[PDB]
């Protein structure tokens, strides 16, 4: 029972509530209709959405609980510019009346939540997450939060889904807050700024850890493929490799071996930030194979479809992962080479997501018949002695029972992510 719900269906933004809130969209918005829909605010005037709620809706008590639910994507720092990103807040989401009611606000590596009462006292409560870790969950993808107020006790930040922070706000009075929540960038002094924002929903009473954790997984689309950055996954589009359970290192071709061979990730590193570079190594574009579900250009992948696993920078001619036929052996290389129809080899997959749907993980399937059967992960070269080197691109069917065994299955070598270029990761 949502009191608001934003959605952008048969190209319009519409309160799906049906408690009819009534929307004004700037001349500057990015829309689209994946899943519930989504925007893109740019750092402009024209950039900007603004809700109407109606007077059944509009907050102004001193003690009626609610929430706020939405998803967002910030870009990545620019790594010489680190000093506006960390010390300039800026709103992007709010509702305000003479000063008075709620917003939300991004600080850098911050997300901030800030209460203002009729007498202007104000409480803020914030999540923050690294600016140097070598792979962030959060840097440029999509996440969840959901704030919730207790008047009489806590506000608190569920991040994708679980409980980060709270904070005490019991000293504050009436909010009156105005009719109108405005989706626009205030204060931001970087102008090439922008957000993405999704899901945005308000709710009439504070959820409970149980409610926030379902809303997280309705929300998580669990039967769709998904990108790194938790954009549906794609046809058509070029993809570096990520592996979940090896993340340091990515995959380059051996040519002596016909092979996917590993290499550690290099990195970016001064005193303010880390990370690891993403667009290393094979660069991969996913093919509809012969037969499988009729698509168009640049469609999304589903689990159901069969599909091909291009490589287009080993050569100028296209290569494509091909799987040893009747192998006769728990683990094999995977073989990388020109497009081919030489029976020995086999080149029809699936990708699929056994596990984990909240992730953005994948495993890829080969299932010709028994004798052709497993998932793609990592072996090691040399088994008994750091050594980032030690490793290759392979199918085992050792994988296909250790992801049935009672086990924690997120940092399996059989998790992948598909990382496409984006706007909002640039690195060197």
């Given at each position: ?5 934003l ?25 689209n ?8 605010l ?45 010390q ?7 509702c ?6 709620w917003?939300?606000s ?12 009729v ?6 409560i914030?999540?923050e ?36 922070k ?18 626009k960038?205030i ?21 409970n ?33 990520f ?19 590993t ?24 093919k ?13 992948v ?11 920078n080993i ?37 699929k ?5 909240t ?9 010709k ?6 998932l ?9 002695y750091?050594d ?6 392979c199918?085992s ?28 990761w640039?690195?060197?």
């Amino acid at each position: 029972n949502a009191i608001l719900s934003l959605s952008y269906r048969g190209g319009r933004l519409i309160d799906s509530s049906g408690y009819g809130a009534t929307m004004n969209v700037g001349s500057d918005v990015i829309f689209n209709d994946i899943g519930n829909g989504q925007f893109k605010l740019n750092n402009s005037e024209n950039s900007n959405i603004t809700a109407h709620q109606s007077k059944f809706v509009v907050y102004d008590s001193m003690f009626d609980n609610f929430s706020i639910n939405f998803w967002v994507r910030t870009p990545k720092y620019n790594n010489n510019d680190i000093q506006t990103y960390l010390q300039n807040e800026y709103t992007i989401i709010s509702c305000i009346k003479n000063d008075s009611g709620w917003k939300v606000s991004i600080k850098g590596n911050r997300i901030i939540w800030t209460l203002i009462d009729v007498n202007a006292k104000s409480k803020s409560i914030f999540f923050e997450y690294s600016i140097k870790d070598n792979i962030s969950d959060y840097i440029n993808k999509w996440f969840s939060i959901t704030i919730t107020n207790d008047r009489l006790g806590n506000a608190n930040i569920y991040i994708n889904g679980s409980l980060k922070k709270s904070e005490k706000i019991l000293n504050l009075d009436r909010i009156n807050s105005s009719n109108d929540i405005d989706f626009k960038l205030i204060n931001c002094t970087d102008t090439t700024k922008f957000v993405w924002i999704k899901d945005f929903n308000i709710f009439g009473r504070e959820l409970n850890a149980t409610e926030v954790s379902s809303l997280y997984w309705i929300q998580s689309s669990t039967n769709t493929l998904k990108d790194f950055w938790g954009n549906p996954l794609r046809y058509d589009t070029q993809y570096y490799l990520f592996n979940q359970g090896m993340q340091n290192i990515y995959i380059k071709y051996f040519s002596k071996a016909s092979m996917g061979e590993t290499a550690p990730r290099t990195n970016f590193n001064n005193a303010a930030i880390n990370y690891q570079n993403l667009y290393l190594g094979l660069r991969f574009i996913i093919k509809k194979a012969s037969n499988s579900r009729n698509i168009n250009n640049d469609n999304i992948v589903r689990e159901g479809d069969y599909i091909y696993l291009n490589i287009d920078n080993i050569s100028d001619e296209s290569y494509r992962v091909y799987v040893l036929v009747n192998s006769k052996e728990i683990q094999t290389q995977l073989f990388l080479a020109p497009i081919n129809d030489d029976p020995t080899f086999y080149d029809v997959l699936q990708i699929k997501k056994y596990y984990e749907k909240t992730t953005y993980n994948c495993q890829i399937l080969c299932e010709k018949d028994t004798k052709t059967f497993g998932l793609f992960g990592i072996g090691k070269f040399v088994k008994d002695y750091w050594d980032t080197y030690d490793n290759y691109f392979c199918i085992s069917q050792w994988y296909l029972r250790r992801i049935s065994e009672n086990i924690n299955k997120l940092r399996l070598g059989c998790n992948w992510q598909f990382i496409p270029v984006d706007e909002g990761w640039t690195e060197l």
